[PDB]
Symmetry: none
Subunit: 30 residues, 3 copies
């Protein structure tokens, strides 16, 4: 017979990887 219909859209991709650490904080007080 004729082909079946196409399947549905593929799954959403995985989330991105975790980001870099932030920079060091600001200086302490005198």
């Amino acid at each position: 017979g004729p082909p079946g219909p196409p399947g549905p859209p593929g799954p959403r991709g995985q989330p991105g990887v975790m980001g870099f650490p932030g920079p060091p904080g600001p200086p302490g007080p005198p």
Copy 2:
């Protein structure tokens, strides 16, 4: 004629963007 079975889901999407960098750290010590 008799159409075939539905196809499978499509390819998985591409990965997401890497996470943003973290915020600045705590203030320093005296």
Copy 3:
């Protein structure tokens, strides 16, 4: 009939988790 084609490509994944806060800042002045 034969199975249908695979479906369309999936969408991009979500952005990743933001990175950790940075470490504590440098010592303050004397």
